[PDB]
Every structure is written in C-alpha cells, then in structure tokens.
C-alpha cells in the first residue's frame, strides 16, 4: 500500500509570496501504462475538494500558471509561485497509479493578514432553557487574527473549567480571520447560586485580557 507523506502539516504565507508543498510516496508512482497519476486538490472551508493538477504537472482548466506540480518516481511538489487570498484552504495529493489509491495527509494553507482583536459577546441563559432546569452561558469571540487565543471563564470571580465546551472555525475565505465559541453549561440550581459571569479572551492584540460579562441580577 503506497503511503503518501505530505509535509508540512500547516503553511502560513504572506500574499504575493511563494508556497511549497511536498508529497513523497513510499513507492514509485510510475504506473504500468507509462503514466504517473499524481493529483493535487484543494478543499476550501465548507467545500468539497477540487482538483487543480493531474498527471503530476497538468493544470485543470482555469488554474493559473502560479500553480505548478513537479517531480517523478517518489518525490512530488505542489508549488505556488505567488500566493493569494483565494488559495487558502487544505491541499492534498492523491495517487491513482497503484491499487488501492491513497491520499496524502493534507497541508492546511493559511494566508497571513493584518492583526484583528476578537469581537466578544456574552449571552445569559435563554428563558426557554431555564424552564427546564438547564443554564448555558454562551460566549462568541469573532473575527480575530492570529489564531492563537485563550478563553477563560469566571463565576463570581473564580476561574471555571467544569462544564465548558469550545469550538473553533477554520480560517475564513472572505476576511481570513478565525472565530471561536465557548459555552459554559451548568444546572439551573448552580446558575442561580452565583451572580456575575465572565468571559475573558487572551489574544496578541491586547496586553490585558478582553473581558465581557453580566450579572444574573440583570444589573
């Protein structure tokens, strides 16, 4: 079983610069019919993969000369001479030369952009959910960049980890930012035992955490 080793796992490049992705197979990809079936695909956020290159270096119609595929035998390279906002997404190789066909692990390509502080919003439990003995406090940290970020919850001033669930989005195609959602779930009993609930973000764009909170007394 030919193994496709794709590297690196992630790439972060500035628009206009070159990007290089490598894919090495454990065995020669030269098929019996004299051809080398190495394909390069791009899977944008929320989209189904789309092929950009077939037969190692042939471009599919519409694909700019910026992209070039090269190599032979076992060492292949997808190359983008000048990167741009539309290129962000996941790239991966797919060999169809041997049975069974195999896919590379993938290379997430990130396009750098100007720094953005997360826009933070906190939401108390909905009335509809309190009527059932459940209380969820949702906090959104939207459109930020770089991606490294840290959210912390505080109940009446004390850090809280139990009942916290987080979820992150991939880099956005439009503005190239990242978003995050943190949800603190507790029982209505406990929710009513405390007053102030806080959501704190830690991001490069600020020295002090970016805080957002409310008081159960709606005060």
């Amino acid at each position: 079983d030919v193994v496709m080793s794709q590297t690196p796992l992630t790439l972060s490049v500035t628009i206009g610069q070159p990007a290089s992705i490598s894919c090495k197979s454990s065995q020669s990809l030269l098929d019996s019919d004299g051809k080398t079936y190495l394909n390069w695909l791009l899977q944008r956020p929320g989209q189904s993969p789309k092929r950009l290159i077939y037969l190692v270096s042939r471009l599919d119609s519409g694909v700019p000369d910026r992209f070039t595929g090269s190599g032979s035998g076992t060492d292949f390279t997808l190359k983008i001479s000048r990167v741009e906002a539309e290129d962000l997404g996941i790239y991966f190789c797919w060999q169809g030369s041997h049975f069974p066909q195999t896919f590379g692990g993938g290379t997430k390509l990130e396009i750098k952009r100007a720094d953005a502080a997360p826009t933070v919003s906190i939401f108390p439990p909905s009335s509809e959910q309190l009527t059932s003995g459940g209380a969820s406090v949702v906090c959104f940290l939207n459109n930020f960049y770089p991606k490294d970020i840290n959210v912390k919850w505080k109940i009446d001033g004390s850090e809280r980890q139990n009942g916290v669930l987080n979820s992150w989005t991939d880099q956005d195609s439009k503005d190239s930012t990242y978003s995050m959602s943190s949800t603190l779930t507790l029982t209505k009993d406990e929710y009513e035992r405390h007053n102030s609930y806080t959501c704190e973000a830690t991001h490069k764009t600020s020295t002090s955490p970016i805080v957002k909170s409310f008081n159960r007394n709606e005060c």
């Binding site: 098929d31 051809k35 079936y37 394909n39 077939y54 037969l55 797919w94 169809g96 030369s97």
Partner: protein, 102 residues
C-alpha cells in the same frame, strides 16, 4: 458492456498528420495518454469494415476514458478528436489482422 469483446495486441501508434505544426506537436507530445491497443468483437460478427471499425472505436475510447480518469485524467475536445482519429486507424488495422487470420 464489454461482453464478447476481445483486447487486441499492442501496436505502434499511427503517425497521423496535421500540417499545422502545433497539433502535430500536440499529438506527439500527448500520444502517451492515448490507447495503443483496441477492443473488438470477432470479425465474423460484422458484415463489413465500417461496422467493425465504428463499434471498435466507440468501445475502445469509452473504456479508455473511464479507466484512465479513474486514476486521474482530463480529456478535452482536442484530446477526444485526436483519439478518435488515432483509434480509428488502429481499428482498421485490427480489422486487417482479424481478416488475415481468416
């Protein structure tokens, strides 16, 4: 599908001519992506050559595009035009062979 269809032996690709220097260069540069053997039914099951050839071309081209695109390929309208022209010559030659071995 391919029932009753034999696979003929490999043969040298027909050197077809396109005086336009570009297509000639495109044919030479891409023939490795085209068939070098054909699919046909016993010659006795056809009245003439035109029938054998027309059937051989359609089956050979189709089998070729489905099996190669499975591995990763792209056949343009040029590729298709050149292929039919090339495979037709090979089928006529496959006809002669079958007719020679009675």
């Amino acid at each position: 599908g391919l029932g009753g269809y034999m696979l003929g032996s490999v043969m040298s690709r027909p050197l077809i001519h396109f005086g336009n220097d570009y297509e000639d260069r495109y044919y030479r540069e891409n023939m490795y992506r085209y068939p070098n053997q054909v699919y046909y039914r016993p010659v006795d099951q056809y009245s003439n050559q035109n029938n054998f050839v027309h059937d051989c071309v359609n089956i050979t081209v189709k089998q070729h595009t489905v099996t190669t695109t499975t591995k990763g390929e792209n056949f343009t309208e040029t590729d298709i035009k050149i292929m039919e022209r090339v495979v037709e010559q090979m089928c006529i030659t496959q006809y002669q062979r079958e007719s020679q071995a009675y």
